[PDB]
């Protein structure tokens, strides 16, 4: 399964809003007018079709297993703050958690060229 952080496990989960914040469709109608279950933000309840969020099927399965925050609610999993600069918070390509570049270990100052994954998602070494 996907590992949860201790602070995620016991947090309140917002009532989910049963329509997509991007296209205004319910689970019955994504942008292609096809059924598609929503992913919902645990902080504000805003939802999105995975297709409208531009998630792959593989990321979708993983995010559905976790306490996920929407793009606007995303807070850094290390310091727990938003901070003022949005091009500074990376989103993990394995679990979609946010981390400020400055909060990575070691800190980053430049964008990775390809995928980026957080320390939670990197496996333990032999």
């Amino acid at each position: 399964h996907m590992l949860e952080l201790p602070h995620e496990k016991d947090k309140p989960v917002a009532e989910p809003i049963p329509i997509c914040s991007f296209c205004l469709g319910t689970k019955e109608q994504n942008r292609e007018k096809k059924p598609e279950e929503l992913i919902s933000c645990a902080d504000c309840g805003n939802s999105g079709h995975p297709s409208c969020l531009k998630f792959s099927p593989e990321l979708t399965v993983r995010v559905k297993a976790l306490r996920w925050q929407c793009i606007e609610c995303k807070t850094c999993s290390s310091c727990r703050d938003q901070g003022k600069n949005a091009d500074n918070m990376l989103f993990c390509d394995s679990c979609d958690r946010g981390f400020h570049m400055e909060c990575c270990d070691p800190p980053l100052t430049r964008m990775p060229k390809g995928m980026w994954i957080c320390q939670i998602c990197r496996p333990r070494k032999k």
């Binding site: 991007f22 793009i71 949005a86 091009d87 918070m89 990376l90 989103f91 390809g114 995928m115 980026w116």
Partner: peptide, 13 residues
């Protein structure tokens, strides 16, 4: 890689 900023742009705002 993605950031909050690129995700907003990718998904429409």
């Amino acid at each position: 890689a993605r950031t909050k900023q690129t995700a907003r742009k990718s998904t429409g705002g």
